[PDB]
């Protein structure tokens, strides 16, 4: 569905969450395994969720046509090549793809899972109803870029951004308030900017990336193989966090605003479809 970012319309159930992919695999030739159980597996081709999300099923990776991994900042890298090499696995949909292999397909981190057991932060920032609400209000641009990052999730890049662009007039620093109201302001604030700093965190993919896109705010991300399959989305990819200027962003805004984008990727259906196609 090639269309311009400004034309992004959203429904309540369109937001991508790794949970939605779990239930779609548990209910409806596709196994969802928390990446942690793939990373710290005791057997080579046998894994399981060990009760996580009430899933005691044993997975025989030698017999699964499609494997889905997520709910984690862990990446898929050479450590999992022996699984990727399995001939019966036709597709590996994963969060944080960190290997140049055509069998591995990235899917968006999306939005936090509100239904995480006994976690208010998840119940707060996992609230897609708020994101949907703000996306319906008039997008009155208050400033160019929006900065609200926890530097301690990936200091190497994040600290560099703050050291450089916090003092810029065309940048707004967002306050840190973990609450239903603090979240709403955080969404309304990011909604009111053309861009938003979306650097990688503990994991390569970040929720800020997709919160920004659902609000039609262009996220700024550093180039990474894990993002090499999202270049058909209105994301501003940068070689480094240096020499970003109001002119450069004003240039990329007009370009990114004039282009057509595969915005259907932002919808859960695109990934339901892709999992059904391969399975
Ligand atoms: C003040 C407390 C800070 C956190 C302390 C714990 C450090 C590890 O926490 C990891 O790094 C953080 C910077 C977050 O990204 C965190 O994310 C989770 O919580 C967010 C609020 C949600 O938004 C996300 O969806 C996701 O549930 C992420 O945890 C996931 O990845 C891990 C591998 O790294 C494990 O697989 C774990 O099981 C997963 O949940
Ligand atoms: Ca566009
Ligand atoms: Ca540069
Ligand atoms: Mg717009
Ligand atoms: Mg790499
Ligand atoms: Mg990662
Ligand atoms: Mg990739
Ligand atoms: Mg045009």
Author numbering: -1 to 26, 29 to 279
What does the paper say about this structure?
The crystal structure of A075L in complex with trisaccharide 6 shows a clear density map for the acceptor, including the octyl group. The Rha moiety is located within a deep pocket and establishes hydrogen bonds with His122 and Thr112. The Gal ring engages in four hydrogen bonds with residues Asn202, Ser72, Asp36, and Lys34, and is also somewhat exposed to the solvent. Given its close proximity to the acceptor, Asp73 appears to be the best‐positioned residue to act as a catalytic base, facilitating the deprotonation of Fuc O4. Analysis of the X‐Ray crystallographic structure of A075L bound to the trisaccharide provides an explanation for the observed specificity. The D‐Rha moiety is deeply inserted in the enzyme pocket, which, in turn, places the C4 hydroxyl group of the L‐Fuc moiety near Asp73. Deprotonation of this hydroxyl group by Asp73 facilitates nucleophilic attack on the donor. This exquisite arrangement highlights the specificity of the enzyme for a minimal acceptor motif. Epitope mapping analysis for the three acceptor substrates revealed that, despite minor differences in intensity, most of the protons of the three model acceptors showed up in all three STD NMR spectra. These results strongly suggest the existence of a groove‐type binding mode, wherein the entire ligand, particularly the Rha and Gal units, are embedded within the enzyme's binding site, rather than interacting with a shallow region. Thus, it appears that the motif present in 4 (α‐D‐Rha‐(1 → 3)‐α‐L‐Fuc), is the minimum acceptor for the enzyme.
Protein A075L is a β‐xylosyltransferase that participates in producing the core of the N‐glycans found in VP54, the major viral capsid protein of Paramecium bursaria chlorella virus‐1 (PBCV‐1). The protein structure shows a typical GT‐B folding, with two Rossmann‐like fold domains, in which the acceptor substrate binds to the N‐terminal region, and the nucleotide‐sugar donor binds to the C‐terminal region. We propose that the catalytic mechanism follows a direct displacement SN2‐like reaction, where Asp73 serves as a catalytic base that deprotonates the incoming nucleophile of the acceptor, facilitating direct displacement of the UDP with the inversion of the anomeric configuration of the acceptor without metal ion dependence, while the interactions with side chains of Arg158 and Arg208 stabilize the developing negative charge. In this context, we herein present the structural and biochemical characterization of A075L, a soluble chlorovirus xylosyltransferase easily produced in E. coli and amenable to large‐scale purification.
